[PDB]
Design a protein around this ligand. Structure first.
Ligand SMILES: C[C@]1(c2cc(/C=C(\F)c3ccc(C#N)cn3)ccc2F)N=C(N)S[C@@]2(C(=O)N3CCOCC3)C[C@H]21
Length: 380
């Protein structure tokens, strides 16, 4: 799948996007890859933040669905007009499909000032599509209309001390993007890419919580979120343990809450005082799990645009949640992640591009024996 390697671009903290074309003749747009939503939604009006936008009046293949949609989020929102058009991915499979497109005509706190993307490719399932599950997501249309296999994989390559990159392999797996073996965890339910965490360790020390807390009220894999978000109670325990592990240096309380940065002299970040973080995931077999481990290089994120400082500044990118665990870019930048929809499972392997040092690397290890893993899932 050499044609698709390195087909993702982005800037630190602004997301990973793929080039797409919409309409006839084709209009090229940069589109954020989002496993945490299920709409294909593109700027269609001259918002000043946008490099370009979808001009339906130029497309002979545009079809109006004569239906609008209003999509509010916890902060910000977008509103759009639904239709269909022909869509292709230049550095993807050599096909064209007719897909739903939400033409965004009003938004707030949605587009990012300074970013180079103009829309979002929601790769999750129809149950969470807006306005309802009758709006077929893009990937469903792709698979239905072509012979592309029903899976995709993501290698998100992060940065350290602004340009990120990676690969979205559509319809398969490229073995050059990972080392070791893939380990799979079941997709618990096809809405978000929902998974079940069965154990959490900080530098190998179990947090010893009731594992339902780790998945209250869900745990998901989301390329459209930067942080590792943890349920409030889990975040409290995790930070207590990370604070203790890292206690040879003291930091203001506000740093751990994401309320302020911490800066060090260039090149002197003390990586070794910060612990590794391990999530054990439900395995494929009864009573079997595996673990994924990330480094501070993943969860301490460089902040480049700090005019008021001259040093190397970082943001703590593990944060508390009210929506469950969110394995965002902090997790995904450590791994090659296989969204094996056909077999309702997600594979993890150590990413051949993840950021590490000479002493520690990200890891995917198993098998481990874990009992009562079904009890870890939350039910209303
Ligand atoms: C559509 C939405 C969304 C995402 C985004 C994503 C980004 F801006 C972004 C930025 C940096 C990085 C990195 N590294 C990655 N992504 C930018 C805008 C944006 F809207 N998608 C999400 N995954 S989070 C989101 C949300 O709250 N939900 C809950 C309801 O179900 C769908 C997702 C805000 C939603």
């Amino acid at each position: 799948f050499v044609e698709m390697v390195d087909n993702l671009r982005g800037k630190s903290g602004q997301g990973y996007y793929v080039e797409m074309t919409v309409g006839s003749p084709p209009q090229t747009l940069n589109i954020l890859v989002d496993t945490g939503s299920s709409n294909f939604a593109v700027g269609a009006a001259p918002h000043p933040f946008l490099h370009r936008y979808y001009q339906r009046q130029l497309s002979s293949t545009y079809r109006d669905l004569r239906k609008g949609v209003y999509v509010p989020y916890t902060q910000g929102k977008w509103e759009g007009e639904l239709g269909t058009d022909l869509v292709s991915i230049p550095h993807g499979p050599n096909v064209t499909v007719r897909a739903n497109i939400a033409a965004i005509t009003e938004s707030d706190k949605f587009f990012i000032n300074g970013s180079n993307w103009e829309g979002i490719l929601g790769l999750a399932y129809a149950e969470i599509a807006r306005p309802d599950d009758s709006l077929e997501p893009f990937f469903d249309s792709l698979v239905k209309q072509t012979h592309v296999p029903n899976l995709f994989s993501l290698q998100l390559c992060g940065a350290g001390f602004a340009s990120v990159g990676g690969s979205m392999i559509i319809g398969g797996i490229d073995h050059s993007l990972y080392t070791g073996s893939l380990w799979y965890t079941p997709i618990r339910r096809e809405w978000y890419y929902e998974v079940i965490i069965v154990r959490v360790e900080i530098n190998g020390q179990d947090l010893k919580m009731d594992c339902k807390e780790y998945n209250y009220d869900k745990s998901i894999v989301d390329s459209g979120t930067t942080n590792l978000r943890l349920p409030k109670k889990v975040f409290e325990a995790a930070v207590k343990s990370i604070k203790a592990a890292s206690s040879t240096e003291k930091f203001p309380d506000g740093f751990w809450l994401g309320e302020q940065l911490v800066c060090w002299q260039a090149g002197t970040t003390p990586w070794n005082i910060f612990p590794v973080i391990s999530l054990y995931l439900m395995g494929e077999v009864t009573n079997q799990s595996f673990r994924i481990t990330i480094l501070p290089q993943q969860y301490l994120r460089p902040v480049e645009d700090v005019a008021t400082s001259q040093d190397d500044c970082y943001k703590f990118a593990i944060s508390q949640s009210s929506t469950g665990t969110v394995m965002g870019a902090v997790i995904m930048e450590g791994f090659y992640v296989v969204f094996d929809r056909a077999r309702k499972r997600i594979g993890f392997a150590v990413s051949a591009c993840h950021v590490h040092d000479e002493f520690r690397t990200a890891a995917v290890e198993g098998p481990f024996v874990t009992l009562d893993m079904e009890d870890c899932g939350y039910n209303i």
